[PDB]
From a paper:
We solved the structure in complex with [name]‐N at a resolution of 3.25 Å. The asymmetric unit contains two molecules of the (β‐IgSF)‐([name]‐N) complex, which are similar to each other when superimposed (r.m.s.d 0.20 Å). The β‐IgSF domain has two β‐sheets labelled ABED and A′GFC, with sheets connected by the BC, EF, CD and AA′ loops. The unique features of this domain are (a) the absence of cysteine residues, (b) absence of C′ and C′′ strands and (c) a truncated C strand that is directly followed by a 1.5‐turn α‐helix. Specifically, L46 in the α‐helix of β‐IgI3 interacts by van der Waals forces with F29 and L95 (distances 3.34 Å and 3.59 Å) located in the C and G strands of [name], respectively. In addition, the protruding β‐IgI3 residue V53 is within close contact of I91 (distance 3.36 Å, F strand), Q44 (distance 2.50 Å, C to C’ loop) and S32 (distance 3.41 Å, C strand) of [name], D55 is within close contact of Y34 (distance 3.50 Å, C strand) and G41 (distance 2.90 Å, C to C’ loop) of [name], and F42 is in close contact of L95 (distance 2.87 Å, G strand) of [name]. No conformational changes were observed in [name] upon binding of β‐IgI3. For [name]‐N, the crystal structure of the complex indicated that β‐IgI3 interacts with the dimer interface, contacting several residues which are important for [name] homodimerisation and for binding to other bacterial adhesins. In contrast, β‐IgI3 interacts through the small α helix and loop, with a single residue, L46, critical for β‐IgI3 to fit into a pocket on [name]‐N formed by F29 and I91.
We report here that surface‐expressed β protein of GBS binds to human [name] and CEACAM5 receptors. Human CEACAMs are a family of 12 cellular receptors belonging to the immunoglobulin (Ig) superfamily (IgSF) that are commonly expressed on epithelial cells, endothelial cells and leucocytes (Gray‐Owen & Blumberg, 2006). β protein is a multifunctional protein and interacts with several proteins of the human immune system, including factor H, Siglec‐5, Siglec‐7, Siglec‐14 and IgA, through distinct domains. A crystal structure of the complex showed that an IgSF domain in β represents a novel Ig‐fold subtype called IgI3, in which unique features allow binding to [name].
Author numbering:
A (entry chain A): 0 to 107
B (entry chain D): 7 to 109
Write the structure that this text describes.
Amino acid sequence: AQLTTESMPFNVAEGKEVLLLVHNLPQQLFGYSWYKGERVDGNRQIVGYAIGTQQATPGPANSGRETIYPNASLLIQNVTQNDTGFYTLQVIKSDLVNEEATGQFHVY
Amino acid sequence: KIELTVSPENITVYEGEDVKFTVTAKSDSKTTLDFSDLLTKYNPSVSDRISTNYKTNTDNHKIAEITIKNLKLNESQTVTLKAKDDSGNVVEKTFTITVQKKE
């Protein structure tokens, strides 16, 4: 069940919200981090959430409209142009075998 | 039945400097590792810090080089690693990381 990332909508009006859904959260997962872009780059982390600690720590890419949910779903509010593009999600697991899985959305 | 070992037993490192170590856990029946403790201690916010090269992964002979990026000054702990197999055997083997300044 390979971790997938439908965005709702795909094509988002400026000022409207978009919600990145996640469909196959594994078991024995320690947490999720969202990144802006295609690769999992530290400099470009949106936010992480450890489920045990149940604590989400904004990364350097956070704009304070994201509200990450415990089901790994994101939700970016009041979107504008620079949001457009890809968003890798990584899920790190107890045994340190991780799962990248990227989604998209385009703003008009 | 289960072996579990951690390369440099009691590690020490200067702040800013990184930490290498290699976890090695082998046994009859599929062995998997548990870094629950290593993660909560050194990756409390989820982040790309900690690389984990599984040099010869295998079903039964799991070896992994972990690399904890850019230790901060207040990150000294003893950390308990774990290995579990199919029959239902667990193994806790602990190890220490300790960090300091240079000037």
